């Protein structure tokens, strides 16, 4: 499913209008910055629960 981005990133502590949660590594959360820089693929599932707009 697809929803808002109400979440945070534990790699830089700077959530950004987006959040990808890697399963294989579990309890692992990445933002648009760390994800682009680190290059951590792993079938991530976008998790959100806020208002999109």
């Amino acid at each position: 499913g697809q929803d808002r981005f109400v979440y945070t990133c534990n790699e830089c502590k700077h959530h950004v209008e987006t959040r990808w949660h890697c399963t294989v590594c579990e309890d692992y959360d990445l933002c648009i910055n760390c994800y682009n820089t680190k290059s951590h693929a792993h079938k991530m599932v976008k998790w959100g629960l806020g208002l999109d707009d």
């Binding site: 648009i32 910055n33 682009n36 290059s39």
Partner: protein, 103 residues
């Protein structure tokens, strides 16, 4: 436990050991005759790249231009588009040398 189920890897195909992840290959080639080959870290606005090249040579704010793909982009953003993996190529145009030549 073994490197490969078959037996062993040729190692020939894989030469050297580089991350080739954090860093990317960004270069420029103006019409005049410029050839630069180097890698820059991808964690800051592309500005921290052309700024060194531009300052050490010339500023785009006149003749020199940086075309990321098929348009013009600002140097105050990073997540706007960039998102390069490794092979990052930027085209530039030089109307004038800015020196030596009268025009």
């Amino acid at each position: 436990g073994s490197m490969s189920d078959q037996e062993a890897k040729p190692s020939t195909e894989d030469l050297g050991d580089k991350k080739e992840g954090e860093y990317i290959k960004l270069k420029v080639i103006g019409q005049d005759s410029s050839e630069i080959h180097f890698k820059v870290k991808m964690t800051t606005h592309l500005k921290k790249l052309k700024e060194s090249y531009c300052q050490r040579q010339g500023v785009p704010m006149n003749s020199l231009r940086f075309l990321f793909e098929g348009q013009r982009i600002a140097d105050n953003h990073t997540p706007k588009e960039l998102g390069m993996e490794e092979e990052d190529v930027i085209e530039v145009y030089q109307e004038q040398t800015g020196g030596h030549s009268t025009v």
